[PDB]
Ligand binder design. Structure first.
Ligand SMILES: CN(c1c(N)n(Cc2cccc(F)c2)c(=O)[nH]c1=O)S(=O)(=O)c1ccccc1
Ligand SMILES: CN(c1c(N)n(Cc2cccc(F)c2)c(=O)[nH]c1=O)S(=O)(=O)c1ccccc1
Ligand SMILES: CN(c1c(N)n(Cc2cccc(F)c2)c(=O)[nH]c1=O)S(=O)(=O)c1ccccc1
Ligand SMILES: CN(c1c(N)n(Cc2cccc(F)c2)c(=O)[nH]c1=O)S(=O)(=O)c1ccccc1
Ligand SMILES: [Cl-]
Ligand SMILES: [Cl-]
Ligand SMILES: [Cl-]
Ligand SMILES: [Cl-]
Lengths: 296, 287, 287, 296
């Protein structure tokens, strides 16, 4: 081989019956958060990390639905591919399903229902996606660490343990649903055994990187918003939250077309074409306004 | 007897991109799909035979969600509206479904809440001739059909989206009609529901009941208003430990389905709050 | 005749630091002070003579806000509760104010909304003997006085904050009493409102009306619930272009103040939406 | 004189009748935003800028009320003083009223009803308060620039004009209610004439710095939240917004006691005393928890 890059996975899996009957009609990661489908937020997050090649993993039923919404990604300067998860057998299963898509590249996994907002978010992802060996994750102070993977730090701020959904959390630092990996992850994933719960656990993957001294745990500070989209009540909170930012600023959070245009993955002419069929609503108007406004 | 029509029509691109993935009247308002609210309204009016009209794209969706209704003691049929050519078009599309019966039309994105709502609908469905509509005081009557009243409280004019509204009373998206409505609908020229209602008013056959300020009438037309409606329902539901517009519950309380059938519908939802709630309805007395 | 008591008692430190700067029942729920809601409730029950009971710190505040009531056609008096020693203490403090009349007690942080609320209070104020209270279905009956009903819907027990509630029916913070309540209150031992109500129940003189699910009963006890109540009122108000619990409007519609007096009250508020609204009430018919 | 600092002003003025009747009972900047009084947010902002000597300007009626809430500031390691504004004759009046308090020091003015949130907010204020000459302001993209002082930028991103409440804004960049000044501001303030509106305008002050080439205009990016507290509807939005962050994180935004403790203006023993009278509620519990939890 002669030499002369990082791929993305969004896991937009089966949310069971927990949100029924809202989710009988459609899958969770197609429900909107305010003005746009849920999937637009993690997708925008990957794009902001600089990732253009992305694998959307969803149920067999829902795959066609995501495909229709997003296509191959070519209109936004992306290359989207699709795969199915027959059964919700754990988040780490994404690496077995995604094996051939990853190939010998670096990867990044994002949960389909994870929403992030804040200043210099681009720069915080930059430093994770720039480290070419090991794994990088983010830890975020929360009220209810029991629901997540919890990181324990020593007095020097070094990460020393990881626990999935501990009943007695060692700290309030939760592992967020955004993960960066080197080429070792597929092989670490293949050697995992199901948990007592029947799942291939992402925390087991991260524990394996930690055990080799190859796990970077960056803090995502309190000045960032990491929102919960797990309940009816939290989905509603996230909507309110985005609407308040958007109506205050006259700017959008996680508008993929805008992110593609600012990254130079699409040009002015292409952005204008995408604005055309949306011209009679606020979203298309906003795309048009981006052609002529300078936004710092 | 009285049949129902839910018009769950084409919202265009106005709510894109939320609506690229799915039609509007399938978006949830808090914990359930939008369509559940007007459907519940019809059920509360005592109507079991109901026509769901939607776009060609969305009609199969609503079918796939709701089926023939038989699990909730209903009889649901489906029809398509090729182009959003006005709300009155429901009566042409719905012609053969209505047959020679009385009808009721409800808008697919109209949400109602309040005390004795069952009784308020009762009096409208009970009037066997003419048409019945409801007027509700709003901030922005320009968006709606506006009713003008004389000093005696008699309705004397109707205007669709007037630039200078004569009053702040808006016509809500719930309409009751006799057997004349199909023929009135056929004779309309370019297709407004306000024209239909104006024809009933011109013959002295339009009842305009006030829906008082103690009732909530919410519009799910915008991203902002959809979010308002969610907050509103969630606050009521979490306060009461009771649901608003749960079709299964309405069917059970109307005796259109029995305890055994309710239990079967609770089964596949058992692992979430909605199924638990259906189960709890078998054993709790709720006044 | 029936007198009113608003208990606007000491919230302790539980809402600090919001409440360091001012008492709770002066915090606004959306556009108006909290106290306006229970006050409006009493006015809607037809009660004009009202005792406001609060802490020593906060009583002068409520006085300075509301005065003697004469601008709204009311007669407001004030009294203090030195220590938050239970809601039933209102009747000892309020003894000489009540005199030999019938009474009504409302909690200072209780918010009610819905259709025909005037009529529901009417039937309670109209019963001249015994006591009347309202039961409302809630998610968390542990926080309240809980009513247990038999299979015939008769009330058979009352429990204050039981760990194992017998039903989900909570007693709301609105109470109507005959002339027996002062003497029942004096004979209580360490001072619960549920004990007072239990004494009426034990003599077969407690009416427990259901406040149905079509009514909203909101609690303003927490930061979270205060915020919920704000959202809820704002959504109704911005939808309707009408206010909930505007005392001036209630006084005007009850004929306790006239058009001229309403106009004077609109004057100093003219440059904001609230004064504009009072002005608009002089000329708009609202059903 | 022998040599061997920056003072703050919070303008918490008369909001007229615009929010009546909510504001009949009490002044605006004492209304809570969620769990805490409004004044706590701009105060926390000054503290985060490193400012300990602060002048609270309010109406004659409301002064005693702020005083009771906040005292002399000594419990939080601050030195708070108070002054009255007899009539709401414009924001720039703060420098005439504050003349003797400012003396020959550098200053910072913050509006009493301005709420800010985001990542590295400390660092963004640091670079403004660190510049010892000229003035520094912040520009923030909004939907409704008409309501504010608007900044116009040239193609190189240089600020070239300032307009107060223009009916036809030149950009969507609004000047936020946070201002840093050198020793020239009192004298610039003294030479101002009332506007057509009867007000001593802050924008006139800022225009004078601009005209001498001494106005730094830093962008406050979209990843920051700058919230509106001007209406009943916006006050409610700000509450929802703070509550969603706080309940998600189990951390507080603009808790002055926490900011004083992290700045080392008060010690562990002092923080424990302040937690005592609040022990039976969530706020005091949170102060206590800060003594033992490491928070990054
Ligand atoms: C507010 N954020 C954001 C931005 N910061 N930006 C500016 C941007 C765009 C492309 C590349 C950049 F480096 C910065 C956007 O164009 N859209 C955004 O939503 S964000 O970084 O917090 C964010 C990005 C993606 C998904 C969620 C939040
Ligand atoms: C809160 N409401 C309500 C009720 N009052 N009821 C009880 C009910 C059911 C059938 C007949 C009745 F009279 C009362 C419900 O079972 N579900 C409800 O959502 S409502 O009448 O205002 C309503 C009905 C239909 C759709 C939305 C709200
Ligand atoms: C929406 N409601 C309401 C009204 N229905 N009315 C109209 C009114 C006034 C006096 C007597 C009436 F029957 C009706 C009001 O004038 N103000 C109101 O807030 S309410 O009856 O549910 C209510 C009354 C008192 C306090 C809060 C809500
Ligand atoms: C979330 N923010 C914040 C923080 N970032 N911090 C951490 C902190 C405290 C003191 C000094 C620091 F450099 C950082 C806090 O202790 N409390 C806070 O509210 S903030 O910077 O966006 C903020 C600070 C003051 C007022 C409003 C927001
Ligand atoms: Cl931060
Ligand atoms: Cl009503
Ligand atoms: Cl009811
Ligand atoms: Cl930013």
């Amino acid at each position: 081989h002669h030499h002369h890059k990082r791929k993305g996975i969004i896991l937009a899996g089966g949310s069971g019956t927990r949100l029924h009957p809202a989710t009988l009609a459609i899958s969770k990661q197609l429900l909107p958060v305010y003005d746009k489908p849920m999937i637009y937020y993690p997708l925008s997050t990957l794009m902001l990390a600089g990732i253009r090649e992305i694998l959307i993993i969803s149920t067999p039923q829902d795959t066609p639905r995501f495909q229709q919404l997003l296509g191959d990604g070519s209109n936004w300067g992306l290359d989207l591919q699709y795969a199915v998860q027959p059964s919700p057998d754990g988040l780490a299963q994404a690496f077995l399903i995604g094996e051939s898509f990853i190939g010998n590249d670096l990867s990044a996994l994002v949960l389909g229902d994870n929403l992030y907002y804040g200043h210099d978010f681009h720069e915080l992802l930059g430093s994770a996606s720039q480290r070419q060996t090991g794994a990088s994750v983010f830890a975020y102070h929360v009220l209810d660490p029991e629901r997540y993977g919890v990181v324990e730090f020593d007095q020097g701020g070094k990460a020393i343990s990881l626990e999935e959904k501990p009943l007695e959390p060692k700290s309030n630092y939760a592992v967020t649903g955004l993960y960066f990996y080197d080429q070792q992850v597929v092989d670490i994933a293949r050697d995992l055994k199901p948990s007592p719960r029947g799942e291939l656990e992402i925390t087991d993957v991260n524990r394996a990187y930690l055990e080799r001294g190859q796990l970077s745990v960056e803090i995502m500070g309190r000045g960032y918003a990491w929102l919960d989209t797990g309940t009816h009540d939290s989905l509603l909170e996230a909507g309110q939250f985005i609407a308040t930012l958007e109506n205050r600023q006259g700017l959008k959070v996680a508008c993929p077309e805008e992110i593609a245009y600012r990254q130079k993955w699409i040009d002015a002419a292409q952005l204008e074409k995408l604005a055309a069929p949306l011209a009679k609503n606020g979203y298309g108007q906003y795309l048009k306004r981006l052609l002529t406004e300078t936004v710092y």
